[PDB]
Amino acid sequence: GPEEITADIPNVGEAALSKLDESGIVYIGAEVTGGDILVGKVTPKGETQL
């Protein structure tokens, strides 16, 4: 499958929308530090078995 740029990143908290917009890209002028997200992106991968 294709990889999409979204804000629906799995396993995230309020820190997501804190810096990121409704789309998944950080607002122009936001203060970011080591660890924060700049562009939300997810890649398809099923299976895994678990």
């Binding site: 002028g29 936001a30 203060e31 530090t33």
Partner: peptide, 15 residues
């Protein structure tokens, strides 16, 4: 102060 003040702190605020 990396972010130990104002949990939200608007974009306009310049430190």
């Amino acid at each position: 102060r990396i972010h130990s003040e104002e949990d939200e702190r608007p974009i306009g605020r310049l430190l």
